[PDB]
């Protein structure tokens, strides 16, 4: 039922790694604070996307057993992560309580970004998915390591490992589900659906951020790696 | 090579 000593331990040892990460209160400050062009918003979000992977490499390097996976499996793991974290990292920014009429402001200023009508659709209909399900903190720091320990991953050659590394991950974040909400037993089984409509996100990232509304589409070295750009 | 700046993030430290 409740978590063991080792699991507290994991738990704590995650949220330090997570926390880590530019904070939330950061970004909305700047989208709110004032309207920017779509040249603008464009080069935020890379300069934002960049910073992402730098903090996501050392938060993945710090997932117990991680560095003891092949290391063509690590890349894999990484490159394979990247868009869906970012995404991830986005929707709970997103549905960070704000004072009253600030969220509304935060979706229009993004939905005027730059970024197509037909990717924002889906995008918002993802974070407003993931606001209802009510996440703690520890579940989204959770749901985080278990997107970058997915043993399913395109060019993994040693799932097996990749799996062992998952388990206790998933084990730990069942048992929150159960705490954090005792009335919805379904609860952990939706946190786990919702990673399937967060794979979407991969076969069309290259196309959201081509038909961004600026004349030039400028990435930064590392971006161009982890992103099918350039 | 392909992927050489996330091999050299994984690599270092
Ligand atoms: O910076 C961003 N996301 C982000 C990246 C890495 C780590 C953390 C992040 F929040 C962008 C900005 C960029 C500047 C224009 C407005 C949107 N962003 C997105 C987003 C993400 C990816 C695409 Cl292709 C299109 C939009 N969804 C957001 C939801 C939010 F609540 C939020 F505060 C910012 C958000």
Same mark, same amino acid.
């Given at each position: 039922?409740?978590?063991?000593?080792?699991?507290?331990?994991?738990?704590?040892?995650?949220?330090?790694?997570?926390?880590?990460?530019?904070?939330?209160? #950061? =970004?909305? &400050? $700047?989208? /709110?604070?004032?309207?920017? %062009?779509?040249?603008?918003?464009?080069? !935020?979000?890379?300069?934002?996307?960049?910073?992402?992977?730098?903090?996501?490499?050392?938060?993945?390097?710090?997932?117990?057993?991680?560095?003891?996976?092949?290391?063509?499996?690590?890349?894999?793991?990484?490159?394979?992560?990247?868009?869906?974290?970012?995404?991830?990292?986005?929707? #709970? =920014?997103? &549905? $960070?309580? /704000?004072?009253?009429?600030? %969220?509304?402001?935060?979706?229009?200023? !993004?939905?005027?970004?730059?970024?197509?009508?037909?990717?924002?659709?889906?995008?918002?209909?993802?974070?407003?998915?993931?606001?209802?399900?009510?996440?703690?903190?520890?579940?989204?720091?959770?749901?985080?390591?278990?997107?970058?320990?997915?043993?399913?991953?395109?060019?993994?050659?040693?799932?097996?490992?990749?799996?062992?590394?998952?388990?206790?991950?998933?084990?730990?974040?069942?048992?929150?589900?159960?705490?954090?909400?005792?009335?919805?037993?379904?609860?952990?089984?939706?946190?786990?659906?919702?990673?399937?409509?967060?794979?979407?996100?991969?076969?069309?990232?290259?196309?959201?951020?081509?038909?961004?509304?600026?004349?030039?589409?400028?990435?930064?070295?590392?971006?161009?790696?982890?992103?099918?750009?350039? | 090579?392909?992927?050489?700046?996330?091999?050299?993030?994984?690599?270092?430290?």
């Amino acid at each position: 039922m409740e978590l063991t000593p080792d699991q507290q331990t994991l738990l704590h040892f995650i949220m330090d790694s997570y926390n880590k990460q530019r904070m939330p209160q #950061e =970004i909305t &400050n $700047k989208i /709110l604070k004032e309207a920017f %062009s779509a040249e603008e918003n464009f080069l !935020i979000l890379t300069e934002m996307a960049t910073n992402h992977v730098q903090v996501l490499v050392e938060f993945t390097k710090k997932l117990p057993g991680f560095q003891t996976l092949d290391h063509e499996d690590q890349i894999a793991l990484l490159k394979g992560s990247a868009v869906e974290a970012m995404f991830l990292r986005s929707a #709970e =920014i997103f &549905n $960070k309580k /704000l004072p009253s009429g600030h %969220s509304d402001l935060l979706e229009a200023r !993004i939905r005027n970004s730059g970024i197509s009508d037909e990717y924002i659709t889906p995008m918002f209909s993802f974070y407003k998915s993931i606001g209802e399900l009510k996440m703690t903190q520890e579940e989204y720091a959770l749901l985080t390591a278990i997107v970058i320990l997915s043993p399913d991953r395109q060019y993994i050659k040693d799932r097996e490992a990749v799996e062992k590394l998952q388990e206790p991950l998933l084990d730990v974040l069942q048992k929150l589900c159960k705490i954090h909400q005792p009335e919805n037993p379904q609860h952990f089984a939706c946190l786990l659906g919702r990673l399937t409509e967060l794979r979407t996100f991969n076969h069309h990232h290259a196309e959201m951020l081509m038909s961004w509304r600026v004349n030039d589409h400028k990435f930064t070295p590392l971006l161009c790696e982890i992103w099918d750009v350039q | 090579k392909d992927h050489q700046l996330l091999r050299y993030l994984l690599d270092k430290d």
